[PDB]
Amino acid sequence: MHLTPREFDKLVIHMLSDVALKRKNKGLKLNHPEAVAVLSAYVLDGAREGKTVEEVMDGARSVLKADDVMDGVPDLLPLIQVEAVFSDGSRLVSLHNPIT
Amino acid sequence: MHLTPREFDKLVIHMLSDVALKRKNKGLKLNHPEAVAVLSAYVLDGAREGKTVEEVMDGARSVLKADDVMDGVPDLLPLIQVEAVFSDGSRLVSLHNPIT
Amino acid sequence: LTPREFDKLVIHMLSDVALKRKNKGLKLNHPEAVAVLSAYVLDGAREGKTVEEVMDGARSVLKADDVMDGVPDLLPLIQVEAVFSDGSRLVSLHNPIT
Ligand SMILES: [Cl-]
Ligand SMILES: [Cl-]
Ligand SMILES: [Cl-]
Ligand SMILES: [Cl-]
Ligand SMILES: [Cl-]
Ligand SMILES: [Cl-]
Numbered sequence: 001m002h003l004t005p006r007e008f009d010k011l012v013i014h015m016l017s018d019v020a021l022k023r024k025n026k027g028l029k030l031n032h033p034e035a036v037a038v039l040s041a042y043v044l045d046g047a048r049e050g051k052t053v054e055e056v057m058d059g060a061r062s063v064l065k066a067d068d069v070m071d072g073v074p075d076l077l078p079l080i081q082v083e084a085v086f087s088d089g090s091r092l093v094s095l096h097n098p099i100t
Numbered sequence: 101m102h103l104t105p106r107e108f109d110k111l112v113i114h115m116l117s118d119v120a121l122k123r124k125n126k127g128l129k130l131n132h133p134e135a136v137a138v139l140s141a142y143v144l145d146g147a148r149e150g151k152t153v154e155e156v157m158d159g160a161r162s163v164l165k166a167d168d169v170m171d172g173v174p175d176l177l178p179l180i181q182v183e184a185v186f187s188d189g190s191r192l193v194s195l196h197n198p199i200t
Numbered sequence: 201l202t203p204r205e206f207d208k209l210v211i212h213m214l215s216d217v218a219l220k221r222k223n224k225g226l227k228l229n230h231p232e233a234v235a236v237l238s239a240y241v242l243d244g245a246r247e248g249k250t251v252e253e254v255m256d257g258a259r260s261v262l263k264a265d266d267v268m269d270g271v272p273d274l275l276p277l278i279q280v281e282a283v284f285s286d287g288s289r290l291v292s293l294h295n296p297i298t
Contacts, residue, residue, distance in 0.1 A: 001112060001137065011112070012201070012209070014119050019212050028247065049128065101211060101234060111210065114217050149226065 006083070010044060013082075017041030030069045032076045035099065039063055040082045043093045047084035056084075056093055064099045074099045106183070110144055113182075117141030130169045132176045135199065139163055140182045143193045147184035153191055156184075160195045174199040204281070208242055211280075215239030228267045230274045233297065237261055238280045241291050245282035251291055254282075258293045272297045 003011070016037035020030055030038065042063050046056035066074050080095040103111065116137035120130055130138065142163050146156035166174055180195040201209065214235035218228055228236065240261050244254040264272055278293040 001109065001116065001133070001140075003112065008112075011115060011119065012206075015115055015209060015213055019209070023246065026247070048123065049126070101207065101214065101231070101238065103210070108210075111213060111217070115213055148221065149224070 013037055013040045013044060024068065029067075030064065030073070032070075032073050035064055035069050035073055035077060036080060039077075039080050039095060039098055043080075043082040043095070044084050047086045047091075047093075050087070053086060053091055053093055057095065060095050060098050061100070066100060069099060113137055113140045113144060124168065129167075130164065130173070132170075132173050135164055135169050135173055135177060136180060139180050139195060139198055143180075143182040143195070144184050147186050147191075147193075150187065153186060153193055156193055157195065160198050161200070164199050166199060169199055211235055211238045211242060222266060227265075228262065228271065230268075230271050233262055233267050233271055233275060234278060237278050237293060237296050241278075241280040241282050241293070245284050245289075245291075248285070251284060251289055254291055255293065258296050259298070262297050264297060267297055 016033070017040070020034040020038045023034065024030060024038075039060060042060055043056055046059065051059075074097075077099055078097055080098055082093050082095075083090055084093055085091075116133070117140070120134035120138050123134065124130060124138075139160055142160055143156050146159060151159070174197075177199055178197055180198060182193045182195070183190055184193060185191075214231070215238065218232035218236050221232065222228060222236075237258060240258055241254055244257065249257070272295075275297055276295055278296060280291045280293075281288055282291055283289075
């Protein structure tokens with residue numbers, strides 16, 4: 001292939017998220033890096049799907065609920081930031097307190 | 101588990117392929133590097149399954165049609181070349197104009 | 201990811217690839233078998249199994265019929281570092297494929 005470091009980081013995220021979601025479908029509450037991976041992949045998928053920055057923000061609040069992660073993970077995650085390519089280019093997407 | 105650089109590259113092709121096929125599954129037209137991953141993983145899988153070079157070449161032509169990829173992708177893709185191990189060792193597989 | 205963390209991701213991704221091949225009815229090769237059994241150790245530890253339950257379950261993950269001829273004797277030992285409840289542990293699988 002010919003992956004930039006940024007592109008590879010993006011794939012890692014997709015791979016960590018699939019691993020995470022498999023664990024979620026087995027009934028395991030997610031840890032902090034697993035949650036970050038799931039939420040980050042959600043931003044990447046959104047931008048890939050043509051979603052706007054705002055629709056990605058809007059939707060991301062509903063991806064993991066407090067009950068889906070281990071105790072303490074929500075206060076470990078006041079902010080996630082992910083760069084994704086939207087229709088006008090590369091943008092840093094901010095998810096504030098995504099998990100409640 | 102020690103992977104050689106070439107083996108790691110093969111893993112990266114399979115994982116990029118998997119991400120691209122998930123997108124196709126959702127009805128999204130594939131971009132250029134996505135199409136390259138899917139066709140490249142096809143060759144690797146073909147070789148792994150004991151198909152001949154010629155069988156993989158024949159098979160690869162129907163993997164992705166023009167409607168499966170974004171406008172412009174077919175003429176962005178006159179040639180894909182993928183090294184894979186066949187029953188007589190490493191071979192450089194050339195896919196000519198695979199997306200029509 | 202730390203190098204060790206990245207190694208574990210690589211193990212999961214090689215195992216997924218090996219399992220898809222198993223589902224196609226292909227006999228696994230040696231490194232495919234290693235990835236499957238290693239990912240199994242990693243999964244059991246993450247699920248909260250003890251080292252002993254992981255060892256006990258591991259012997260039944262791949263049978264001789266699931267792997268190419270010669271693979272069992274190429275595999276007298278797998279060792280996998282995994283994080284259990286009291287920290288990092290080196291799990292040994294002795295003769296896992298019979
Ligand atoms: Cl990707
Ligand atoms: Cl992406
Ligand atoms: Cl591979
Ligand atoms: Cl391969
Ligand atoms: Cl992992
Ligand atoms: Cl793990």
